């Protein structure tokens, strides 16, 4: 789904684990009941795609944004296709 | 029974007849009767006069009828004279708090025209 969008997604992940989880430290530790200075609330001139709330969780194969399933990492369409062929282990039809 | 204004409520439990005062609901009324040391389920009949003006003395400590109506009106006028979104929105007569006007804005907008 539009190569550009998948490339954009990889950009957001790479910035997400470069800056944040290392300087997202700020928003967890210094924005707190400690002193204060306005400074670390203004030290969010980090490139806005380091934010991990900007990944979409696209389908791993087709990049489809909607219908994602976090367990399999795929959209519902590729979950069904692969589920029926037998590449998803353990998964089968359900009836109860 | 003429408490907090021209408000005269009576023949009803004191937690609920106090709710007739514009600016006290159930919580604030429990606060008035607890602060004045009055049981919650006595009427205004069967309640003494010194007891009544202890309720007057307690209801005087919150912003009620006139002061509250002009405080609310003052807030809305400040918004409509700013010309913010909440003021233009408040001014046209359309829902303020980001609700749906495509359909079902009907309290705020009034019964349907043609």
């Amino acid at each position: 789904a539009k190569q550009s969008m998948k490339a954009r997604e990889v950009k957001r992940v790479a910035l997400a684990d470069k800056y944040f989880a290392k300087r997202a430290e700020l928003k967890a530790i210094i924005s707190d009941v400690n002193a204060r200075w306005n400074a670390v609330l203004k030290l969010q001139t980090l490139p806005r795609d380091s934010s991990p709330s900007r990944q979409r969780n696209r389908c791993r194969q087709t990049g489809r944004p909607h219908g994602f399933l976090r367990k399999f990492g795929l959209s519902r369409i590729k979950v069904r296709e692969a589920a029926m062929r037998g590449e998803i282990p353990g998964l089968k039809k359900a009836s109860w | 029974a003429r408490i907090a204004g021209i408000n005269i409520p009576d023949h009803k439990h004191a937690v609920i007849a106090l709710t007739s005062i514009y600016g006290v609901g159930k919580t604030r009324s429990k606060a008035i009767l607890a602060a004045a040391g009055i049981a919650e389920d006595v009427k205004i009949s069967e309640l003494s006069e010194g007891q009544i003006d202890t309720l007057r003395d307690e209801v005087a400590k919150f912003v009620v009828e006139g002061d509250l109506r002009r405080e609310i009106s003052m807030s809305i006028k400040r918004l409509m004279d700013l010309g913010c979104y909440r003021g233009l929105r408040h001014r046209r007569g359309l829902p303020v708090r980001g609700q749906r006007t495509k359909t079902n804005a009907r309290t705020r907008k009034g019964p349907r025209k043609p």
Partner: protein, 79 residues
Amino acid sequence: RSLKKGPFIDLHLLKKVEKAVESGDKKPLRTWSRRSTIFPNMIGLTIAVHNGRQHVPVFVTDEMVGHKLGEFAPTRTYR
């Protein structure tokens, strides 16, 4: 509303407001940053706020202060 800790403005708008009050209110400011809570030092400036297509000038009065910028720049034109 929001935020027990700090209000919000962008750092570029912080610097443009500091330089705007230091060297006097000369010109309206191009601001895209509608995210931004009006500060009391911003009183008297003319800050044009982007409404999707146009920067509309907002003259800051004293009672603008507990508000975002974009409240004074409507985005949809209804007739």
